[PDB]
Amino acid sequence: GIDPFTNEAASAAGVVGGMVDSITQAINQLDEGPMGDPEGSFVDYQTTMVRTAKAIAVTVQEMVTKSNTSPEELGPLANQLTSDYGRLASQAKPAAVAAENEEIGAHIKHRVQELGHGCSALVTKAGALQCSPSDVYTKKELIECARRVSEKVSHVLAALQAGNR
DSSP: OOOOOOOOSOSSOSSSOSHHHHHHHHHHHHHHOOOOOOSSOHHHHHHHHHHHHHHHHHHHHHHHHHHHHOTTSHHHHHHHHHHHHHHHHHHHHHHHHHSSSHHHHHHHHHHHHHHHHHHHHHHHHHHHHHHOTTOHHHHHHHHHHHHHHHHHHHHHHHHHTTSOO
16 A cells, blocks of 8 residues: 555664674675676776765765764764665676776775775764764764775775776
């Protein structure tokens, strides 16, 4: 029928949990290798990935900011960082395989790994921060995590231009 979604209490955890495992999964899936069968040239996937990277960058830069004012806004942003990263982790495989050089594809995949470790840490910190928005240490760790993510975005972006345009 109309199909309503009664999201009462939580699916499993009210804070950021569960999808953090997805980020770790995204790390492992890339460690495996590229997907293959690119629909376009490396430049097409390049331009796609750099856009999504800038997209996660604005999220992480928002999270570092919002943690000071709005600790409950960290959850939806952690969700956004998680989702956009999930898309990047999907786009990274066709990008790596579209490269005419293993060192280039390996350069891309490893940078998304950089993001994976940071993204994972940021979202799990946001979860723990929402559990106790008052805890300065958890918030500080999140700020650290956010910085690490934003830093790695630059490394990801720079990895792309070294490939086939």
